Design an enzyme around this catalytic site. Structure first.
Site, PDB file in Angstrom:
ATOM      1  N   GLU A   1     -33.593   4.201  -8.076  1.00  0.00           N
ATOM      2  CA  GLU A   1     -34.311   3.508  -9.172  1.00  0.00           C
ATOM      3  C   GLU A   1     -35.593   2.857  -8.717  1.00  0.00           C
ATOM      4  O   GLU A   1     -36.552   2.736  -9.502  1.00  0.00           O
ATOM      5  CB  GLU A   1     -33.386   2.518  -9.871  1.00  0.00           C
TER       6      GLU A   1
ATOM      7  N   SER B   1     -40.029   5.245  -0.553  1.00  0.00           N
ATOM      8  CA  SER B   1     -39.205   5.221   0.671  1.00  0.00           C
ATOM      9  C   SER B   1     -39.752   4.373   1.810  1.00  0.00           C
ATOM     10  O   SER B   1     -39.027   4.188   2.802  1.00  0.00           O
ATOM     11  CB  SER B   1     -39.074   6.619   1.309  1.00  0.00           C
TER      12      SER B   1
HETATM   13  C1  LIG Z   1     -38.997   8.345  -0.379  1.00  0.00           C
HETATM   14  O1  LIG Z   1     -40.020   7.948  -0.937  1.00  0.00           O
HETATM   15  N1  LIG Z   1     -38.233   9.400  -0.769  1.00  0.00           N
HETATM   16  C2  LIG Z   1     -37.110   9.932   0.096  1.00  0.00           C
HETATM   17  C3  LIG Z   1     -37.430  11.388   0.516  1.00  0.00           C
HETATM   18  N2  LIG Z   1     -38.408  11.578   1.644  1.00  0.00           N
HETATM   19  O2  LIG Z   1     -39.823  11.449   1.284  1.00  0.00           O
HETATM   20  S1  LIG Z   1     -40.660  10.578   2.276  1.00  0.00           S
HETATM   21  O3  LIG Z   1     -40.448  11.230   3.592  1.00  0.00           O
HETATM   22  O4  LIG Z   1     -40.158   9.187   2.239  1.00  0.00           O
HETATM   23  O5  LIG Z   1     -42.038  10.652   1.699  1.00  0.00           O
HETATM   24  C4  LIG Z   1     -37.922  12.222  -0.667  1.00  0.00           C
HETATM   25  C5  LIG Z   1     -38.959  11.539  -1.440  1.00  0.00           C
HETATM   26  C6  LIG Z   1     -38.437  10.201  -1.953  1.00  0.00           C
HETATM   27  C7  LIG Z   1     -37.483  10.115  -2.984  1.00  0.00           C
HETATM   28  O6  LIG Z   1     -36.477   9.366  -2.898  1.00  0.00           O
HETATM   29  N3  LIG Z   1     -37.569  11.047  -3.967  1.00  0.00           N
HETATM   30  N4  LIG Z   1     -36.760  10.950  -5.052  1.00  0.00           N
HETATM   31  C8  LIG Z   1     -37.219  10.128  -6.038  1.00  0.00           C
HETATM   32  O7  LIG Z   1     -38.123   9.310  -5.913  1.00  0.00           O
HETATM   33  C9  LIG Z   1     -36.561  10.291  -7.434  1.00  0.00           C
HETATM   34  C10 LIG Z   1     -36.924  11.666  -7.935  1.00  0.00           C
HETATM   35  C11 LIG Z   1     -38.407  11.840  -8.195  1.00  0.00           C
HETATM   36  C12 LIG Z   1     -38.827  10.790  -9.242  1.00  0.00           C
HETATM   37  N5  LIG Z   1     -38.511   9.453  -8.682  1.00  0.00           N
HETATM   38  C13 LIG Z   1     -37.048   9.280  -8.443  1.00  0.00           C
END
Ligand SMILES: *C(=O)N1C[C@H](NOS(=O)(=O)O)CC[C@H]1C(=O)NNC(=O)[C@@H]1CCCNC1
Length: 268
Positions: free
Chosen positions: A146, A48
């Site tokens: 993705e 993210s």
């Molecule tokens: C970002 O990295 N994100 C969005 C969200 N917030 O986390 S953070 O504040 O940015 O650290 C949640 C974590 C993450 C995200 O999108 N998680 N989902 C995924 O990455 C999918 C599920 C887990 C495996 N990878 C795909």
């Protein structure tokens, strides 16, 4: 005589020993020009964390396109993907570009990120923006979700701690953006809600911090970058990224905070 970089680096190597993976750090003191660097030019998945730079690219576009931040984006139900907690509230109205930007930065909203990517010409448009400020390392290739695959050896959707820190500095403290846009980027970063256990945890509470986090959910891969404003001092810009070789290796917010602390303490 120059810095003994082996001595600067040692505690990061011990930290990453216990963590079971790789830690990459770059920190810049804009007062003295001192730096701390550890695997600073290695690639790590952005996860993210690209969303901060996405918000900057939107701000740059707003310089050429008056009122862009005010524009409504009225999206359908298929915009909604998991970890989209703000954009999921506003399906019945849409959101402005500004609200979407704030949500991408401060709640890490995935759908908001995808919507803004679309406005800027996809992953390639964001990458082009980064190339425009001299960042040759950054690459965003894929979309949410993705882009989080974090496969060891995959260069897609990565940058380096050094490139992240240098670009963040240019955009928040340098004049890469006009002053109003620069202050808006800083304000968005300062209001992030997801970073309390990462770089912020290493910083005295009376010093302002802006940051953006990332957590891919696999391969022990997670990160944070920030600007820190010590009272009556030049600001510090830093980035901490992790990865690890097994899909089920855990990420660690404590390791990020520890690495931040070692970097901040080691400057100058
Ligand atoms: C970002 O990295 N994100 C969005 C969200 N917030 O986390 S953070 O504040 O940015 O650290 C949640 C974590 C993450 C995200 O999108 N998680 N989902 C995924 O990455 C999918 C599920 C887990 C495996 N990878 C795909």
């Amino acid at each position: 005589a120059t810095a003994l970089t082996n001595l600067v680096a040692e505690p990061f190597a011990k930290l990453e020993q216990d963590f079971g993976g790789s830690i990459g750090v770059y920190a810049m003191d804009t007062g003295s020009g001192a730096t701390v660097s550890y695997r600073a030019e290695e690639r790590f998945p952005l996860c993210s964390s690209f969303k901060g730079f996405l918000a900057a690219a939107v701000l740059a576009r707003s310089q050429q396109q008056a009122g862009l931040l005010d524009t409504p984006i009225r999206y359908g139900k298929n915009a909604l993907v998991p970890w989209s907690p703000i954009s999921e509230k506003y399906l019945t109205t849409g959101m402005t570009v500004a609200e979407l930007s704030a949500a991408a930065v401060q709640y890490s909203d995935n759908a908001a990120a995808n919507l803004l990517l679309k406005e800027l010409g996809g992953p390639a448009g964001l990458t082009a923006f980064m190339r425009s400020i001299g960042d040759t390392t950054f690459r965003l290739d894929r979309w949410e979700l993705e882009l989080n695959s974090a496969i060891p050896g995959d260069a897609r959707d990565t940058s380096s701690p050094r490139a992240v820190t240098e670009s963040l500095q240019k955009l928040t403290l340098g004049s890469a953006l006009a002053a109003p846009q620069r202050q808006q980027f800083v304000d968005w970063l300062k209001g992030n809600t997801t970073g309390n256990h990462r770089i912020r945890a290493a910083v005295p509470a009376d010093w302002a911090v802006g940051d953006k986090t990332g957590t891919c959910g696999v391969y022990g891969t997670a990160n944070d970058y920030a600007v820190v404003w010590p009272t009556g001092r030049a600001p510090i810009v830093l980035a901490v990224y992790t990865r690890a070789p097994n899909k089920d290796d855990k990420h660690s917010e404590a390791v990020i905070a520890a690495a931040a602390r070692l970097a901040l303490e080691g400057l100058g």
